[PDB]
Amino acid sequence: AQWRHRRGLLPEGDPLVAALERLADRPRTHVFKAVGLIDAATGETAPPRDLEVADGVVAGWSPTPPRPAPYDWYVTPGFVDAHAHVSSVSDLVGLLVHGVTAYRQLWGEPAHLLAAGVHRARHAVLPRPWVTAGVVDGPGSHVPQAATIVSGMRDVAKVVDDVLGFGFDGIKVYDDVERPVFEALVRDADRAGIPVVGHVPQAVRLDVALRTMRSTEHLYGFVPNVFRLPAAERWDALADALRHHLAEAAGHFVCPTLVAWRARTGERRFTRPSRAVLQAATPSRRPAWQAAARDALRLDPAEAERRGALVDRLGRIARALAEEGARLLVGTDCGNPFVVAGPSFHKEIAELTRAGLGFGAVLKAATADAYDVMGWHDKPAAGRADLVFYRRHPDDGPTGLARPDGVLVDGVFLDGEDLDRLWSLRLSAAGLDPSAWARGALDPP
C-alpha cells in the first residue's frame, strides 16, 4: 500500500499543505543587505556583506559599503535534524518553523521520496529529506512487521536494488542483523556507493561498525540498546554499562539523540510532558504519547532523578567522543512520545551544550557535518539557499537558535510573521490554542 499512499505526507484538502503550497509561489530571488555569515565550524561572523539569492541559489556576496557597516542580519546555514521520523505535514511545518531545512528520515518510505519530488518541483515549501530504504533487520527482529528481514545475500541484494532503482539515499540497520549478513551488506553497499547507518548490531564488534557505517545512532554500541530489555531492568542495565565504561570513533559520525533518551526516562524536568503537548500531538501518535504520560505520572521522583543522571552521563560521553575527534550530529527521534518535530531539535542542542559543547561545535553538528554525513557536498552556505536569519546574534539572548527572524528555504523567505503564522496553524490544526505555545518556547508554558 506504500505506492497508493505515496502522497500521504501532503494530503489533498489539508490546511497546512495548502499553506505550504501557497508559500511555494513566492519569489526565490532576493538581496539581503548587511548580512553577517556565521561560519558553520567556528561560530565567528564574516564582515557584513550583501547576499544575492538567484532562483533559490546563493549567487554571491557583495561587501557592504561603510563608518563600518552594522549587521542587519546574522545568518547560519539551514539546520538538519539528523534523525527524524516525519509522518505528517505537521512535522514538516514544525521543522521549518525552527530553522530545520533538511532531515534524515531513518525509516524511509516511498512517501518521503514523493516529498523529495515535491521539493525538487517547488510545489510546496518543505525541508529536503534524506531517505533510507526502510530499515533492515535480522530474524529475531523486535520490529518484524515494519522491518525488511534480511538473512542472506539475496535478501541484501534486493535492498540494494530498491536503493539504486528508486533513489533512496542509504540503508539503515537494526539490532538483530546477523554478523555475516552485516559484513556482506556493508561490503556490497560500499561497492555500490550506498551509506549504511543505524544501530550497531548486537552481533557486530563496535570497532567494525565504526569503520564501516557512515553513522551510528543513539550511542548504541558504546552503551547497549536497553530498550530491548524488560522495562524493569532497562535503567539498571544502563547503569551497569556506564559503571563499566572512544578514540576508535575519531572521524566517525555519531548521532546520540540525547533528547530522545531523556524523553524515554519518564523524567519531567527537560521533557515536560503535559496535556498541552499531548493536544499538539497528531491523532495517530496520541495513544502512545498518552501511555508514556501515564508512565511519567507513575514514576517515583527519586527514580526519575536517577535516570536523568544516567542521560547526563550519556551527554558527557557524546562530549568526550567529540574531543576524541568524532563528528557529532543533532538528531531527535522526533515522533517518539513528547519529542516534537521542531522544538526537539533545539532541545537536543540544549542537551549537547549542557554536556559542555560550545556554540561553534554544536552549530557545526547542526549544519556542516550533517551535510557531510548526507553526502551533500555543496558548501553549507552555498548552492541551495537554505539559510537561517537572526536580527541579533543567536549566541546571545534567551532563545538561542530556536526563534529565527527568518528562514530561507530553497530561496523562499519566510519572515517572522510567516513563521508565527505557520506555527500557530500547526498548533490550531491539532486542536491546541496557539496562545498556549509561543514560537521560540521549547515547551508550552
**With CB cut-offs between 5 and 8 Å by kind, which of Cl ion, Zn ion, none does residue 275 bind?**
none
Cβ closer to Zn ion: 90 or 105? 105
Cβ closer to Cl ion: 159 or 296? 296
**Alpha carbon distances (Å) from 10 to 86, 275, 418:** 12, 27, 20
**Site size toward Zn ion, by CB under 5 A:** 2
Do 62 and 72 contact (CB within 8 A), yes or no?
A: no
Closest CA to 197 of 257, 253, 139, 141: 253
d(CA 128, CA 124): 11
Query: Any idea what DSSP says for residue 271?
Result: T
By CB atoms closer than 10 A (0-12, 13-18, 19+), residue 125 is buried
Residue 241's contacts (CB-CB under 8 Å, 6 or more residues apart) are 223, 224, 226
| Site residues (CB under 5 A) for Zn ion, limited to 233-292 | none
Plot region of 383 (φ>0 → left; ψ -120 to 50 → alpha; else → beta): left
* Stretch of 52-60, 332-340, 408-416, 431-439 contacting Zn ion, by CB under 5 A: 332-340
Angle between helices 343-354 and 301-323 (to 10 degrees): 80
**With CB cut-offs between 5 and 8 Å by kind, which of Cl ion, Zn ion, none does residue 314 bind?**
none
For residue 137, state whether it binds Zn ion (rule: CB under 5 A).
no
Chain centroid to CA 114: how far? 19
* Stretch of 165-173, 271-279, 327-335, 378-386 contacting Zn ion, by CB under 5 A: 327-335
Closest separation in Å from C-beta 435 to Zn ion: 32
**Alpha carbon distances (Å) from 375 to 146, 263, 276, 323, 369:** 26, 30, 38, 23, 10
> Which residue of this chain has its Cβ atom nearest to Zn ion in the complex?
333
Closest separation in Å from C-beta 260 to Cl ion: 20
Q: Whats the size of the chain, residue-wise? A: 445
Closest separation in Å from C-beta 360 to Zn ion: 27
**With CB cut-offs between 5 and 8 Å by kind, which of Zn ion, Cl ion, none does residue 205 bind?**
none
d(CA 83, CA 348): 11
Cβ closer to Cl ion: 282 or 290? 290
Interacting residue ranges for Cl ion, rule: CB under 5 A:
293-294
**Residue position matching grid coordinates 496520541:** 286
d(CA 429, CA 427): 5
**Residue position matching grid coordinates 519530488:** 117
Cβ closer to Zn ion: 217 or 386? 217
**With CB cut-offs between 5 and 8 Å by kind, which of Zn ion, Cl ion, none does residue 333 bind?**
Zn ion
Closest CA to 332 of 357, 303, 356, 365: 365
Closest separation in Å from C-beta 366 to Zn ion: 18
Closest separation in Å from C-beta 74 to Zn ion: 32
C-alpha triplet 215, 149, 219: angle, nearest 5°: 25
Closest separation in Å from C-beta 144 to Zn ion: 16
Cβ closer to Cl ion: 216 or 265? 265
Cβ closer to Zn ion: 90 or 225? 225
**With CB cut-offs between 5 and 8 Å by kind, which of Zn ion, Cl ion, none does residue 294 bind?**
Cl ion
**Residue position matching grid coordinates 517515583:** 300
For residue 348, state whether it binds Zn ion (rule: CB under 5 A).
no
Cβ closer to Zn ion: 333 or 369? 333
C-alpha cell at 60: 554571491
74: helix, coil or strand? strand
**With CB cut-offs between 5 and 8 Å by kind, which of Zn ion, Cl ion, none does residue 293 bind?**
Cl ion
Closest separation in Å from C-beta 293 to Cl ion: 4
| Site residues (CB under 5 A) for Zn ion, limited to 93-122 | 106
Q: Which residues pair with 74 in a beta bridge?
A: 36, 390
Rule CB under 5 A: choose which of 91, 109, 175, 333 binds Zn ion.
Answer: 333
For residue 169, state whether it binds Zn ion (rule: CB under 5 A).
no
Cβ closer to Cl ion: 146 or 291? 291
For residue 178, state whether it binds Zn ion (rule: CB under 5 A).
no
For residue 81, state whether it binds Zn ion (rule: CB under 5 A).
no
Cβ closer to Cl ion: 74 or 289? 289
Contact residues toward Zn ion (CB under 5 A) are 106, 333
